[PDB]
Symmetry: C3
Subunit: 127 residues, 3 copies
């Protein structure tokens, strides 16, 4: 197909703003994250939000406390069941605009990417 | 959701006991694993068992001889077809209580994790 | 199952020949790949072909221009939708006969594996 290409996929705009951070002042989030990490050191606190452009279902709950040794892939299935995804619908997680390996553990992601309020922030989208 | 978290996922209990090892004495397993590795050096012998708590189907066969360059992900699909998983059901593999990368090859997992009887042991579960 | 193994999976024959290369002389491919990489440096040109033995659907288009920061896993879903895979059908990508990690980016694969005509070649199969 001479000079012909099919342009597919979109470069991430990196513009994911979490509503959680707009609705809860930093000092309140940090106090809470610090406390929950002290109380439950084998668990990590995670905020999960849908990317605004995503056309899949929203979550009822956004604050999760998950085992540090749980993988991304296990978390994927737990979240997918909560939004009732059509069988053929894709679901991707983004941490700081990057999709993590599905065998990474939630503790590993948290250690590397948690924010200064001691939460790990994950966005999800359908593309 | 003030002080509110949804607790999801379970920390692995690491208590996976393989029935294969309870039914076949170590020396018989080792003799067999040694022999099959000598005869078929480009293949690895694998014991696959369902985690007792898993509510998905059991396998008819547990002893597999697989190409060393086959990936975990290819193996996943071969095993999934054998238990007739509902489309939305999850399937996870565990080697020594850890989920391997799906692009790892069976030979790589075997080299790192085979037991002293020269078998690689994989447990599977739905969570 | 004494002396009994179930032999499953197939060792890759590494014999994937791309029709694209048989139909377009090297110098024409290189000129084009060089030009498109100069013009669109944040995108990578990819040739996608079905492995001849695969019993899944063929693609209408084989020449794609994809964002460098798109993952393999995102690309998987874009290609899967284009061939209308039955829900339970597997789809695997091979670059130089090896399945890449699904979290690798297309730019990372391109940097490591592009050919001298400046295209990245991906084969897909159902096993």
């Amino acid at each position: 197909s001479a000079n012909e290409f099919t342009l597919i996929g979109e470069a991430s705009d990196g513009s994911m703003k979490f509503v959680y951070k707009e609705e809860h002042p930093f000092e309140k989030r940090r106090s809470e994250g610090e406390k929950i990490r002290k109380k439950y050191p084998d668990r990590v606190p995670v905020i999960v939000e849908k990317a605004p452009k995503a056309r899949i279902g929203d979550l009822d709950k956004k604050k999760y406390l998950v085992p540090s040794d749980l993988t991304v892939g296990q978390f994927y299935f737990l979240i997918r069941k909560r939004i009732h995804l059509r069988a053929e619908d894709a679901l991707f997680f983004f941490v700081n605009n990057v999709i993590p390996p599905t065998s990474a553990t939630m503790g590993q992601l948290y250690q590397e990417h948690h924010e200064e309020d001691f939460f790990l922030y994950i966005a999800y989208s359908d593309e």
